[PDB]
Design a protein around this ligand. Structure first.
Ligand SMILES: N#CCc1ccc(Nc2nccc(Nc3cc(C4CCCC4)n[nH]3)n2)cc1
Ligand code: NA
Length: 276
């Protein structure tokens, strides 16, 4: 309990709840304890965490209860990518961009090999250790395939069926943001998110446009048609080199069927080239 764990400070508080940085009084291990302000989502996530146990996935260590309140004890990692971008608001060095995107793709590759899509990859849930080791967490929106809006693919925004390609979109968004510090698609609403995406990449594919009208969620709403699209080439000139730009264009294909999945990404020149 807080019998056994000393509270060192507050890591975060939000919609997720509250995460405390704590220390075991007997062993002196430092941990992250998530306290809740039990639901199906929690049980689903714990199952996935066990399946995915690995050095690039946050470890759940134990669960306990104090007077009916659930506490989950995790591995503690010193920071997340969101905090890192606050410290470096104009982006990180190109070497660190490649290392974090490599590691993210490797972690997603492991999820996908286990038939799990994460569906909510964003800087806030990418933990980065003192040794620069990236780890994934926050599996509450994840799905097993056999059964805030800024990083979501257009097909997920529209309510379409989805597969492994959903996570590759998020990778492309993070590649850009690590390079210049700026969120690539900062929409203000679901509709404005679709607008912001097309403002860069041009009109959505035919099937997605049809989904806007067949999905009753958008009944009577105005489709956000784009005027003069900008292009990734224009958006990232002087930010991305041609090799990273090439990779980014193939992560951010509007049609999920055209996106590179993880194995193809790892065969890309971005990761296969060796500094001389
Ligand atoms: N819940 C959730 C997602 C989330 C992820 C990160 C943060 N913020 C943050 N900010 C700085 C460090 C940090 N370290 C950390 C978090 C965890 C857990 C994953 C699971 C809950 C403890 N272990 N080590 N987390 C806040 C929320
Ligand atoms: Na750490």
């Amino acid at each position: 309990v807080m019998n056994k764990f000393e509270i060192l400070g507050v890591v975060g508080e939000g919609a997720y709840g509250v995460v405390l940085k704590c220390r075991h009084k007997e062993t002196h291990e430092i941990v992250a304890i998530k306290k809740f302000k039990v639901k199906e989502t929690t049980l689903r996530e714990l199952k996935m965490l066990r399946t995915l146990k690995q050095e690039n996935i946050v470890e759940l260590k134990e669960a306990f209860r104090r007077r009916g309140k659930l506490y989950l004890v995790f591995e503690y990692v010193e920071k997340n990518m969101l905090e890192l971008l606050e410290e470096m608001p104009n982006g990180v060095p190109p070497e660190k961009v490649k290392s974090y995107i490599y590691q993210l793709i490797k972690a997603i590759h492991w999820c996908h090999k286990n038939d799990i899509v994460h569906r909510d990859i964003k800087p806030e849930n990418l933990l980065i250790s003192h040794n620069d080791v990236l780890k994934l967490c926050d599996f509450g929106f994840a799905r097993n395939l056999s059964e805030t809006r800024w990083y979501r693919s257009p097909e997920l925004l529209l309510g379409a069926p989805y597969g492994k390609s959903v996570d590759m979109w998020s990778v492309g968004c993070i590649l850009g943001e690590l390079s210049d510090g700026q969120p690539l698609f900062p929409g203000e609403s679901e509709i404005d998110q679709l607008f912001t995406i097309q403002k860069v990449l041009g009109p959505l594919p035919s099937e997605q446009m049809k989904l806007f009208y067949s999905n009753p969620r958008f009944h009577g709403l105005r489709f956000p048609a784009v005027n003069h699209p900008q292009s990734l080439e224009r958006r990232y000139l002087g930010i991305l080199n041609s090799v990273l730009l090439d990779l980014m264009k193939n992560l951010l294909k509007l049609d999920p069927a055209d996106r590179y999945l993880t194995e193809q990404c790892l065969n890309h020149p971005t990761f296969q080239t060796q500094r001389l």
